[PDB]
Amino acid sequence: KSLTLIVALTTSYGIGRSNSLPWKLKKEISYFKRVTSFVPTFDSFESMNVVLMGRKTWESIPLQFRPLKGRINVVITRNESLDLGNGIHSAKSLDHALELLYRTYGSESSVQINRIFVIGGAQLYKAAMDHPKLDRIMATIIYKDIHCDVFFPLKFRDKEWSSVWKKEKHSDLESWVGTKVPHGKINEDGFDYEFEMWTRDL
């Protein structure tokens, strides 16, 4: 299957700032939660989405929300000297993770994978962007100048990338996520942001 990447970035492609949780957004995280958790419901088997994340992202999730509930969590660590729990998967790279997933949630598993999301960080976003299977980007554009030291690795919303990465209509975004979404800029605590969906032909 295809890989989807989900990210909240500023206009200048800034992903993270100097402190922890540089941008505080309860309605925006709720969107992250619903998109990453939305699955169809079948009577004979269980459907779950997978979230792929790097070790720093894993370590950033408050304890009461970790592992991400109702989703299959996979943490990418090379020097795996991480004490992960029971039910949490770990892989050395993204291709190794995909390998483990198709071997684990196969034909005989009662748990079947729905969608696969790459949730960061920037080293994992870099690897995904280079993956033949990445064809969609779920992006939340923050219309603010936050000091960031970490940027998104490809300026996919720029002119330079327009014949490769296309911004879908709002209605296709709503159809993919399975819910109507507010159009235009949303203000949340002095922050203006907008939801977008970009795809690439494979």
Ligand SMILES: Nc1nc(=O)c2nc(CNc3ccc(C(=O)N[C@@H](CCC(=O)O)C(=O)O)cc3)cnc2[nH]1
């Ligand atoms: N759109 C978007 N917004 C984000 O905040 C985001 N965050 C990450 C990485 N960081 C994080 C950090 C915390 C949680 C988190 O707490 N998730 C909970 C909901 C928390 C809540 O409701 O308060 C979850 O269950 O998804 C997720 C991702 C990656 N892509 C993103 N993409």
